[PDB]
Paper text:
A highly-conserved meiosis-specific structure, the chromosome axis, assembles in early meiotic prophase and provides a scaffold for the organization of chromosomes as a linear array of loops, and also orchestrates the formation of DSBs and their repair as inter-homolog crossovers. Mammals possess two such proteins, SYCP2 (1500 residues in Mus musculus) and SYCP3 (254 residues), which are both required for proper axis formation and wild-type levels of crossovers, and are known to interact with one another through their C-terminal coiled-coil domains. Mammalian SYCP3 is known to form coiled-coil homotetramers that self-associate into larger structures both in cell culture and in vitro, but how SYCP3 cooperates with SYCP2 to mediate chromosome localization and axis assembly is not known. We further show that both SYCP2/SYCP3 and ASY3/ASY4 form heterotetrameric coiled-coil complexes that self-assemble into extended filaments, paralleling our findings with Red1.
We found that Mm SYCP3CC also forms homotetramers in the absence of SYCP2CC (not shown), and when we determined the structure of Mm SYCP3CC by x-ray crystallography, we observed an antiparallel coiled-coil homotetramer similar in structure to H. sapiens SYCP3. To compare the stability of Mm SYCP3CC homotetramers with Mm SYCP2CC:SYCP3CC heterotetramers, we measured their melting temperatures (Tm) using a dye-binding assay. We found that the SYCP2CC:SYCP3CC heterotetramer is more stable than SYCP3CC on its own (56.0°C Tm versus 52.5°C), supporting the idea that the heterotetrameric complex is the preferred state when both proteins are present. While the SYCP3CC homotetramer is likely not the favored state in the presence of SYCP2, its structure may nonetheless be informative as to the structure of SYCP2CC:SYCP3CC. Overall, these data show that the SYCP2CC:SYCP3CC complex forms an extended coiled-coil tetramer with an overall structure similar to that of the SYCP3 homotetramer. Using sequence alignments and the structures of H. sapiens and M. musculus SYCP3, we generated physical models for SYCP2:SYCP3 where the monomers are arranged either parallel or antiparallel, and mapped all identified crosslinks onto these models.
Author numbering:
A (entry chain D): 115 to 211, 218 to 237
B (entry chain C): 105 to 211, 219 to 234
C (entry chain B): 111 to 215, 221 to 238
D (entry chain A): 108 to 238
Amino acid sequence: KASFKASNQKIEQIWKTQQEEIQKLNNEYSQQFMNVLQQWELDIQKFEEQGEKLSNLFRQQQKIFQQSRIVQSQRMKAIKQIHEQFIKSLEDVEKNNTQSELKKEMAMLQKKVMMET
Amino acid sequence: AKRKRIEMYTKASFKASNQKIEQIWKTQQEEIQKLNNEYSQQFMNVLQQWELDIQKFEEQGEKLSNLFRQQQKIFQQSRIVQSQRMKAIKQIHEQFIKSLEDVEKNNQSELKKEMAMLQKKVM
Amino acid sequence: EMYTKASFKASNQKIEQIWKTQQEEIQKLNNEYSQQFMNVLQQWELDIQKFEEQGEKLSNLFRQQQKIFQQSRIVQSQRMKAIKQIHEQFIKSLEDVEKNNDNLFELKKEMAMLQKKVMMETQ
Amino acid sequence: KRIEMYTKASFKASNQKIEQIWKTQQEEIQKLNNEYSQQFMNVLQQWELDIQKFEEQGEKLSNLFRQQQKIFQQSRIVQSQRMKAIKQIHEQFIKSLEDVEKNNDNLFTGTQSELKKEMAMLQKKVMMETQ
């Protein structure tokens, strides 16, 4: 059956060369596909790390917010004191005060006047 | 009696002009207190409003922190799904490729089986 | 002779269908992969553009925060100007009172008249 | 004659002692208000610095955000650049495959035609080997 076997191989050749074509096309695709898919995962990473940076820039601006608050609150309190003391310390000045030291200078002047009469 | 009249008169004269001089001072020092009273109130009323300012600043910022908690939690999920689709297609592709790979490995046994039927039928 | 042409043609029919089947088995694979692929890609596209919307959302939360800061600064500035002025007007108005008080030391009038009284009442 | 001289000069000295009393008191008050003015103004100068330090920080943080926002937007350009890139590759894949199929279907030079030919070529060979 040599005639049958010779034409049996000539058919499979027809087949497999055809199928070889389709496979070379799939290899080329895959290779190309996976290459670009790989660098795409890299860029996808940076794009999330840039999502990070912005989201950190806000939390930073949040901290500023509270620091200013505290600062504001510390300044107002320092002023209030300074003022409360000033007021206290004038109240002590009023207690230190003279209208009798006036009576004394007046009394003396009275003595002086009586004498010379 | 004459002398004792004049003693009394000057003592009187001095008392009265004591009260005068002391009222003079009293009136000024009270003018002064009015200025300082008016001052510290004005003063206090601005410290009062600086404190309202600070609280309305707090509340406005407390509300941003909550809004940012929201947008961040969504943005984080949005970020997780993008890596998930990433895993999904790499898999769809790798599968499609093994299937075509396995298809080739399986590929032919019916061709020879037909030739053998045919040859047997030609015999 | 005539039979073998008949079996030959039947054999060619089975071969043809064998080839056509597998060919159609490949292209079902190619079509189901390329349909999946497209479905995800379109999806992932939307889920990419959704990240931007969340990102543009944050730069608006950012500019809002910045806007809050400009107003607290302006107000703080305006408050400090109010207070510096109240204090300045205070100080000034003490200076003003101190001038009117060089009139008071009035005491010299009291002391004159007292003298005159005492003088006349012993001379 | 000497009496009248004694009462004048006694009143004057008594008068400048009264005035001096009032004077000292007023200087004492003045010194307080001075100090308080200093302490006050000191806290105003700090508060003024605090304002401008807050502003400088937030002005810097906003530029960092400007820059990082551009850097972000370029990264979306990159993303959709990979989209098109991948879409093309797959599309050209499918084109390549339909071309391969169209060529494998040519009635004259397809793969069935090459099959039939060799089949007929076997048949002709088998029937002359009998005759």
